[PDB]
Amino acid sequence: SQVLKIRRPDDWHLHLRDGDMLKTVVPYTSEIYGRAIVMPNLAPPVTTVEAAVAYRQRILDAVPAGHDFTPLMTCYLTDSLDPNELERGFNEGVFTAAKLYPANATTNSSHGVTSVDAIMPVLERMEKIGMPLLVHGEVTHADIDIFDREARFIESVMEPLRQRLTALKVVFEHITTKDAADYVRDGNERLAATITPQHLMFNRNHMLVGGVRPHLYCLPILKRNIHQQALRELVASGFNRVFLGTDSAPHARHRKESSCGCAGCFNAPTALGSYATVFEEMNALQHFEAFCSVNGPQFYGLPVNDTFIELVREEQQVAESIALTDDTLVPFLAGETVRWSVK
Amino acid sequence: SQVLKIRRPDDWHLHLRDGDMLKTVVPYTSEIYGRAIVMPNLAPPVTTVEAAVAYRQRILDAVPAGHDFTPLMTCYLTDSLDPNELERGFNEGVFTAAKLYPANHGVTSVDAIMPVLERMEKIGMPLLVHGEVTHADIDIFDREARFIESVMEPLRQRLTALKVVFEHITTKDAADYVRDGNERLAATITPQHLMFNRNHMLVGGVRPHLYCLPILKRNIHQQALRELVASGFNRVFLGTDSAPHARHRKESSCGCAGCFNAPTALGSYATVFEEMNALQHFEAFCSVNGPQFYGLPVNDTFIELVREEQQVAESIALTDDTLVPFLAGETVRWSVK
Ligand SMILES: [Zn+2]
Ligand SMILES: [Zn+2]
Ligand SMILES: [Zn+2]
Ligand SMILES: [Zn+2]
Numbered sequence: 112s113q114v115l116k117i118r119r120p121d122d123w124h125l126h127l128r129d130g131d132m133l134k135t136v137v138p139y140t141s142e143i144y145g146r147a148i149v150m151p152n153l154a155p156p157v158t159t160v161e162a163a164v165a166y167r168q169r170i171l172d173a174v175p176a177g178h179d180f181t182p183l184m185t186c187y188l189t190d191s192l193d194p195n196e197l198e199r200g201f202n203e204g205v206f207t208a209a210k211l212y213p214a215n216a217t218t219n220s221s222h223g224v225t226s227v228d229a230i231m232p233v234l235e236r237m238e239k240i241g242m243p244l245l246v247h248g249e250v251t252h253a254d255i256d257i258f259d260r261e262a263r264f265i266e267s268v269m270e271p272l273r274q275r276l277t278a279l280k281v282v283f284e285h286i287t288t289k290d291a292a293d294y295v296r297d298g299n300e301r302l303a304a305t306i307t308p309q310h311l312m313f314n315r316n317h318m319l320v321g322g323v324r325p326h327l328y329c330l331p332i333l334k335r336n337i338h339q340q341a342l343r344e345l346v347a348s349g350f351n352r353v354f355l356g357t358d359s360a361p362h363a364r365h366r367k368e369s370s371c372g373c374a375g376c377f378n379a380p381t382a383l384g385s386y387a388t389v390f391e392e393m394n395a396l397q398h399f400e401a402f403c404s405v406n407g408p409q410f411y412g413l414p415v416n417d418t419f420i421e422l423v424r425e426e427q428q429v430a431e432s433i434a435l436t437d438d439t440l441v442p443f444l445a446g447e448t449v450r451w452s453v454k
Numbered sequence: 455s456q457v458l459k460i461r462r463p464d465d466w467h468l469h470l471r472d473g474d475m476l477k478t479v480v481p482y483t484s485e486i487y488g489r490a491i492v493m494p495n496l497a498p499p500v501t502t503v504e505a506a507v508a509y510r511q512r513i514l515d516a517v518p519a520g521h522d523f524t525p526l527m528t529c530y531l532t533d534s535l536d537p538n539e540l541e542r543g544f545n546e547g548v549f550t551a552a553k554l555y556p557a558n559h560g561v562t563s564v565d566a567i568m569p570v571l572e573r574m575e576k577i578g579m580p581l582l583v584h585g586e587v588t589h590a591d592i593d594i595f596d597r598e599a600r601f602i603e604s605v606m607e608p609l610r611q612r613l614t615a616l617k618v619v620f621e622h623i624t625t626k627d628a629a630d631y632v633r634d635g636n637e638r639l640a641a642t643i644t645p646q647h648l649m650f651n652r653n654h655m656l657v658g659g660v661r662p663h664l665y666c667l668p669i670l671k672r673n674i675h676q677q678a679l680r681e682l683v684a685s686g687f688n689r690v691f692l693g694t695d696s697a698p699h700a701r702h703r704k705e706s707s708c709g710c711a712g713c714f715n716a717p718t719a720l721g722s723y724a725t726v727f728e729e730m731n732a733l734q735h736f737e738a739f740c741s742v743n744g745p746q747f748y749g750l751p752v753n754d755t756f757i758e759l760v761r762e763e764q765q766v767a768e769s770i771a772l773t774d775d776t777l778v779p780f781l782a783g784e785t786v787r788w789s790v791k
Pocket of ligand 2: 126
């Protein structure tokens, strides 16, 4: 059985949630990845050093004995955020990056951004101190068709922002379109992107033909096949400013399989082997390690991990569900037979 | 306050299911509509006169005393259907129409059923079409449009006297196609495809109760459908595609397609016509255009809608599970008096 040995990977885009759900889901990340970028979209969000320090410790408390795992914390950008708080957290090694969610005029200033123009002082501060900006690049305006939201972000927000702040380092998180793949391919050394396993493995048909599949519902929404193919081609090319970010985003089963299902795939348990399957299919396994273990560190100016893990091409069955305190979590590819797993 | 009186409507596209579900859902149709086209996609499908006659009795058994409702039965077309079976059922008054479902027991090509279609054309039986292609690599949002080009237009060029209803049209492509067609081409439109677009199903959460086939399209398609009905074009008519499933078959890891809209469809169409400043065309959509296309008389009774806000029930009881109606828990602007 074929063996794939790689430097220990990292996850450059992760949701760990909090409380009991955090206790459940952390082990699936800590058992495999050395570090992860931990997103700040708690309720309430992580917008202060104190909260990030506290949250970091809750994460560390939940790491099983012996796992070598370091959470890399983020600040949720809001209109009200003091640039000095951000800077202090970056300087103290508490915030590795800050995250910009979609703007909306009606958002409370404690919970997000009304527009990019309103948070120039903080963005300028990030440019100054060399702090990376992580972007969920969709516009939210009600008239705009959901499938166009990412492309429209590129024209309306990302390009003007990058033209404004020429030294700002930006990660275009979880890209899902040819439009984004091309934009990132054609960008400079200050622009990178992450790609999830579901956006490489699937397109909107897998979510909507023969049934509606809420466990494949996530944001940005799965796009038509031509976009999926662009993404696969981008990672297969060896392009070195794209890297692993799972966007593992767990919700209890009853919240996914409801009359209004929550967005997000719980893909931490199965992402890495899914990535391996994609790179193999694209005849590009030579570029798999870099994607998983080198490109991200290089973009963030952090060291590459010096231990190794092995995947083995031996069929395993994914769990049907994973028990929480009250309900259950359905993992990405639940109940399926997968091609690659971790040894 | 505002009351709108209309000729009693008919539903030219309905799923009544069978067994306990049939018992629950029929009265929501029979209390309002004089007739309905009862689709044949049972399991197993209705592909014979005997099966159609039995199903029709099960339907009548479940109609409350005092409702004047006539189910109009259909044959489920299959590759191997005997044209004699279809015709006999038409001549006996059992089959009003035949329904073409592209496979995925459905039909795998128009060419495999040409003898059936030629007979239908001969005898003057209308063909009802679920107009989507199904090839795996064709994007779901394109399947209706591709069907027009690859299947519908070549079919109608080959059988120029065949009467065809393009069921539940969902696109500008279909709307223009039907608007520019001849007197042998008509269409039905559902309330959901007038009221909503794909953003309503997908933004801020995934909403399985708005998941139906053909899939809700982009807003420009929705607007084309609204403009078509509002124009007074007389070969579009009411067909709900009420397509009920138990709550937890909708709210699952793989939710079934279909909106249970019988309870709320008539009022929802009223809202759409009002919104388009086209209430003068509402009666004809509901109660005249379908009968004209099918060669049937219009109903000779009337009903009233009243513009008084009612809440739609959060659910409806079944023997097993519940049934969530279209617009459940929502306020609706018009209701039947
Ligand atoms: Zn995101
Ligand atoms: Zn995320
Ligand atoms: Zn249909
Ligand atoms: Zn139908």
